[PDB]
Design a protein around this ligand. Structure first.
Ligand code: R1P
Ligand code: R1P
Ligand code: R1P
Ligand code: HPA
Ligand code: HPA
Ligand code: HPA
Lengths: 284, 284, 284
């Protein structure tokens, strides 16, 4: 069955949030695996567990708290998803992307998406931050898309373009901000490739993904960007490179979830600082 | 759930059509986006809205009228689908391909498939006509296939071959016919790649598709060709190159549905003329 | 709907088998198309039709008998699936992989997977045996995965690694064993790529698969390996190259199911002999 949410379901949820907080966010942030710490910088924060918000799904993955937090971050009013949804949990893309449309109805204009990703580009090192300049939607190639089914004209057009999904102006700002931080390592930039999961990749799959032109691999984000662009939200996002993908059969180890979470904590002070500074000029 | 249509459902629909028209078509034509004008050349035409034919799905995409038209085209009796179905509308492939099997039961022997496609091959120009010599079925790689589920032996075999899907003899005829038209631009020929949609591709996805060896990209056709070959229909098809795919991050624009429809009208007199001439020697 | 089997369903089926046979297998073998002959070497064999075992699905593909056979093979106690399940039959991956988890609950420690595959590597010849050193899971790229949905902690972790799926020690043993057989043709080794089916590939698709780095193509195995590794089973497998994939538009023929079955019978005495010898040192 295609999207089971009607336009009214989104507004009902939006009305409920508006009726339970005085906060009116302009920016929305989605926190990935081991990135839930970004919420700690919010002032005047109000938290809502996903389970208490009508129509909201629930995050079942370790490293995803499952809480919507409103607050002020470096002067800008924003709402953060401390934990997100993935298709490997059993969620159809229309459930995975529910919050994005609700955000649009709350008056939000900018969406910031983050995630933990495996590094495909050889020049990447664990701990690197990669600005997502583009993506490759593998599930979309087969028809698995959050927009499949009747189009809701109240959100956007039937055939939205994706060539300009990641805002160019925001990416320039990200680079200027990084230089101001005095970081020794350069801010990376590249293409993110999404696949279903939940298992980690084989050596053969990784070589293929790299040869397709991808720099980092992950199991989320893309469906949210698609829905976000469909409804006209400005999108900006980045991947925290938590591990280097195994490219040789002499497997000197293998990817594991705790290592990615561990990496998130490791890069906590850096990402939070970066996101906090980025708030200045979103624009508005 | 796999195919919900039983063999009797196809014949019931076929019987209904046979009982409402004296026309006995030997050729079936499926019109894509902005190609609905091909019907205007039919003599003794009888139209049936998809909504009035038992078991028939409905086209919901602008540029797809949703009408089955019987008529005589340049001496040959044929039936045309003015508008088709796509998986991005919410239709499973077994619904998308319903008409093809009904055509087989009407006595049809040849299927002509057309579509509007984005150009991947650098040598293609907007307005070009590309004969489809082969295809790449991305959704099929993952199991999304109109033949998934119990095989109906009354239509074809369990494991049909696809290496000879596009009739070689028809393609030669197409070239000889094109030369007779006195066209300045050459008739192109290549591989069509199908993906789910409904969103348009990212730059990264386009570079990948081109590197996979594809010449044009679209969101239909392949599932119909598969079912058509399974039941033994001779298949011939072509893509109208409506736009050049964006391959560089310096996006000097972006794909949109109206531009493709606009292109269809632009190439109306040419395609109609070409299809009309092709009717001579289908064979029979 | 994600996995419809609860942990108790697997154990119920395991208890039933334990209550109907004195055999306690340590190795499990899954026989592919035209490979059902491997069962003929079992001593003290007890057969169960899939239809009589609670919760077990049924094989509907010619070349798949649909019987679970317990027996002694060259000193080792094992259970064989004479015929397997495929997604193209209409089965979700959670149904396709049901037997693997039951095997784990029977006390099995090693899983041997076999299949008939089309050859992509130019150096392969019909009749060749290719040890699977790795795989590429196309359906998995889109989210079609037997592990999708809530993770059952009693079987394995949420994010299992796959880089070491095919046991290195078993592959070395396979090579030493092959040399002892006095075979003139070398034992091949490579990457297996799985796609949905049931139709055979186009020339364009084959060139693409080869360029992705695949050596053989097939419509099964991978989902079983994934579930097997998730629950900690040692995995070993091989493909019987039944035909050479058509890579040129001058199609001097085309793939067909009987040719693959015919090839299986052709290589019967060789594979059976090889599997029988491999039983020595699984280990235990
Ligand atoms: O994309 P986020 O939400 O960071 O989760 C990333 O981390 C997991 C692997 O450790 C996978 O779920 C992957 O998608
Ligand atoms: O393939 P047809 O029916 O031409 O439609 C083509 O046109 C649309 C894009 O403008 C997409 O639906 C694509 O598939
Ligand atoms: O993989 P097994 O079970 O060998 O079956 C192989 O043989 C069939 C083609 O002849 C396809 O189903 C393919 O997957
Ligand atoms: O190695 C990985 N693979 C896929 N997704 C990931 N997210 C973090 N690391 C990985
Ligand atoms: O750019 C395109 N992409 C996919 N399908 C299309 N059909 C016409 N143009 C396009
Ligand atoms: O040519 C083939 N293609 C896909 N699967 C196969 N299994 C045996 N031969 C083939």
């Amino acid at each position: 069955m295609a999207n089971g949410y009607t336009y009214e379901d989104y507004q009902d949820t939006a009305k409920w949030l508006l009726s339970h907080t005085e906060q009116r966010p302009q920016v929305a942030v989605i926190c990935g695996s081991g990135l839930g710490g970004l919420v700690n910088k919010l002032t005047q924060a109000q938290t809502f567990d996903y389970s208490e918000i009508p129509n909201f799904p629930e995050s079942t993955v370790p490293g995803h708290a499952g809480r919507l937090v409103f607050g002020i971050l470096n002067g800008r009013a924003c709402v953060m998803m401390q934990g997100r949804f993935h298709m490997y949990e059993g969620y159809p893309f229309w459930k995975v992307t529910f919050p994005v449309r609700v955000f649009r109805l709350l008056g939000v204009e900018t969406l910031v998406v983050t995630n933990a990703a495996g590094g495909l580009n050889p020049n990447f090192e664990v701990g690197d931050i990669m600005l997502i300049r583009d993506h490759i939607n593998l599930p979309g190639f087969s028809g698995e898309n959050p927009l499949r089914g009747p189009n809701e004209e109240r959100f956007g057009v039937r055939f939205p373009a994706m060539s300009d999904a990641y805002d160019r102006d925001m990416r320039q700002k990200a680079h200027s901000t990084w230089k101001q931080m005095g970081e020794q390592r350069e801010l990376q930039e590249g293409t993110y490739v999404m696949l279903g999961g939940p298992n980690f990749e084989t050596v053969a799959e990784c070589r293929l993904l790299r040869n397709l032109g991808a720099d980092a691999v992950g199991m989320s984000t893309v469906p949210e960007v698609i829905v976000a662009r469909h409804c006209g939200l400005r999108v900006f996002g980045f991947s925290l490179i938590t591990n280097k993908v195994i490219m040789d059969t002499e497997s000197q180890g293998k990817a594991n979830h705790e290592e990615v979470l561990e990496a998130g904590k490791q890069a906590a002070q850096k990402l939070e600082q970066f996101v906090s500074l980025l708030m200045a000029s979103i624009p508005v």
